[PDB]
Paper text:
Clathrin mediates vesicular transport between post‐Golgi membranes in eukaryotes and is targeted to specific membranes by interactions with clathrin adaptor proteins. A total of 3 consensus clathrin‐binding peptide sequences have been identified and structural studies show that each binds distinct sites on the clathrin heavy chain N‐terminal domain (NTD). We have solved high‐resolution structures of NTD bound to peptide motifs from the cellular clathrin adaptors β2 adaptin and amphiphysin plus a putative viral clathrin adaptor, hepatitis D virus large antigen (HDAg‐L). Surprisingly, with each peptide we observe simultaneous peptide binding at multiple sites on NTD and viral peptides binding to the same sites as cellular peptides.
The viral peptides (HDAg‐L1pep and HDAg‐L2pep) bound at a similar site on NTD. However, in both cases only 2 consecutive hydrophobic side chains could be observed in the hydrophobic pocket (“IL” and “LL” in the cases of HDAg‐L1pep and HDAg‐L2pep, respectively). Interestingly, for both HDAg‐L1pep and HDAg‐L2pep the residues bound at the clathrin box do not match predictions based on alignments to the CBM consensus sequence, 18: in HDAg‐L1pep residues “ILFPA” occupy the positions corresponding to the LΦxΦ[DE], whereas in HDAg‐L2pep the residues “LLES”, including a C‐terminal serine residue that is non‐native and was added to the peptide to aid solubility, occupy the positions equivalent to the first 4 residues of the LΦxΦ[DE] consensus. There was not strong evidence for the HDAg‐L1pep peptide bound at the arrestin box. In addition to binding at the clathrin and arrestin boxes, in 3 of the NTD:peptide co‐crystal structures solved (Amph4T1pep, HDAg‐L1pep and HDAg‐L2pep) a bound peptide could be observed lying across the interface between blades 6 and 7 of the NTD β‐propeller. In the co‐structure with Amph4T1pep a phenylalanine side chain projects deep into this pocket while in the HDAg‐L1pep and HDAg‐L2pep structures the side chains of a leucine residue and proline residue, respectively, bind less deeply. In addition, in the co‐structures with HDAg‐L1pep and Amph4T1pep the backbone carbonyl oxygen of F9 forms a hydrogen bond with a backbone amide nitrogen of the bound peptide, and backbone atom(s) of E11 form hydrogen bond(s) with the bound peptide (1 bond in the case of HDAg‐L1pep, 2 in the case of Amph4T1pep). Despite the similar molecular interactions made between the Royle box and the bound peptides, we note that the direction of the peptide chain differs between HDAg‐L1pep and Amph4T1pep/HDAg‐L2pep. Previous cell‐based studies showed that mutation of HDAg‐L1 L199 to alanine severely reduced VLP production and clathrin co‐immunoprecipitation. This is consistent with our structure, as L199 forms extensive hydrophobic contacts at both the Royle and clathrin boxes.
Author numbering:
A (entry chain A): 4 to 363
B (entry chain E): 1 to 7
C (entry chain G): 2 to 7
Write the structure that this text describes.
């Protein structure tokens, strides 16, 4: 029995998607509701939008955009061509917002239902869709990310901790460079890391949720996963004790590294996916590694939270849309009987109201 | 000049 | 080895 449920939702090539457009710079998946692909049909650029609730009926539209990102919840698309940004409500056939940057945007992403983050060579901006807001600079980029391909930007729930992630080659490996910025302290911290997420976690004995920062890295010391509280604990809270655990890479995966992370706050579990298709699960509280295995023979380049199961959904270069979530009926006996960790099993059972620890 | 057009 | 999906 497996502590996870692993599903294939879609094979994009069955919708006529050219596998040449299945990659990081042409396919976006900002949430589990839509996938968006830029393709050139003949001389014409277009965008194909796949509604994950109705995948046999993709919308195709001509565009002149070098990047397209759908809103996480609504058919509202952000498109850019160089310095020109335009936000369109597709169903209303209207341009909601336009802005012209004074720098190219090398990465952008919806960080919430209504804010787009924009990364230039020099800085990171947030652009709210409310009212007449223009982009606001959040911080300047740290020099440790200079030259990196930017691959992710995330925030905590309150948008007080901001995390920029780049990668580059140093000594013939892929090295991750992160910039963690505190909005309240206005201080950046450079961190070596490949994939990360924030999460809200309420410790036993605390009245308030802690904000945790979880990041995985393959460094010189090998693979490591860290879980720490960021910021000053809310008044009355105990601090969350820092965790650090190994991230295993097998000897035949010598150039693999972590590419994606999502955290289930329903199960307090960390899903970590590596570039070459390995899935790891860790307990958010303790960092204990629950499971590893390989789920994709092709590289995975984009993930989102899989809302329904509180898992992780993603796309590989073949165009499979795959998800992993916790198998709620199996996870506790797995931990008890295969990992032989009754302490963790029992803890997770009562912590997240899962069945199976009636017998340990 | 819209960068998204009708179908 | 590898998991295969439902």
């Amino acid at each position: 029995i497996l502590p996870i449920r692993f599903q294939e939702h879609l094979q994009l090539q069955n919708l006529g998607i050219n596998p040449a457009n299945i990659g990081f710079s042409t396919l976006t998946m900002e949430s589990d509701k839509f996938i968006c692909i830029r393709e050139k049909v003949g001389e014409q650029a277009q965008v194909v939008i796949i509604d994950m609730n109705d995948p046999s009926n993709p919308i195709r539209r001509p565009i002149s955009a070098d990047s397209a990102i759908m809103n996480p919840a609504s058919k509202v698309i952000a498109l850019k061509a160089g310095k020109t940004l335009q936000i369109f409500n597709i169903e209303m056939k209207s341009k909601m917002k336009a802005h012209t940057m004074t720098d190219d945007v090398t990465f952008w992403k919806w960080i919430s239902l209504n804010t787009v983050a924009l990364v230039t060579d020099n800085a990171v901006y947030h652009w709210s869709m409310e009212g007449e807001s223009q982009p606001v600079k959040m911080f300047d980029r740290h020099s440790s990310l200079a030259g990196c391909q930017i691959i992710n930007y995330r925030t905590d729930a309150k948008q007080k901790w901001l995390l920029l992630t780049g990668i580059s080659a140093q000594q013939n490996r892929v090295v991750g460079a992160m910039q963690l910025y505190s909005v309240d302290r206005k201080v950046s911290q450079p961190i070596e890391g490949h994939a990360a997420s924030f999460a809200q976690f309420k410790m036993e004995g605390n009245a308030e949720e802690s904000t945790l920062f979880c990041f995985a890295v393959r460094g010189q010391a090998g693979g490591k996963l860290h879980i720490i509280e960021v910021g000053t604990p809310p008044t009355g809270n105990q601090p969350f004790p820092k965790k650090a655990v190994d991230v295993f890479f097998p000897p035949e995966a010598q150039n693999d590294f972590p590419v994606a992370m999502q955290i289930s706050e329903k199960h307090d579990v960390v899903f970590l996916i590596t570039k070459y298709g390995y899935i790891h699960l860790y307990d958010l509280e303790t960092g204990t590694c629950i499971y590893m295995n390989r789920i994709s023979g092709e590289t995975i380049f984009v993930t989102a939270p899989h809302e329904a199961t509180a898992g992780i959904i993603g796309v590989n270069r073949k165009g499979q849309v795959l998800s992993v979530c916790v198998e709620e009926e199996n996870i506790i006996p797995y931990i008890t009987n295969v990992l032989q960790n009754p302490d963790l099993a029992l803890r997770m059972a009562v912590r997240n109201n899962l069945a199976g620890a009636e017998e340990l | 000049s819209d960068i998204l057009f009708p179908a």
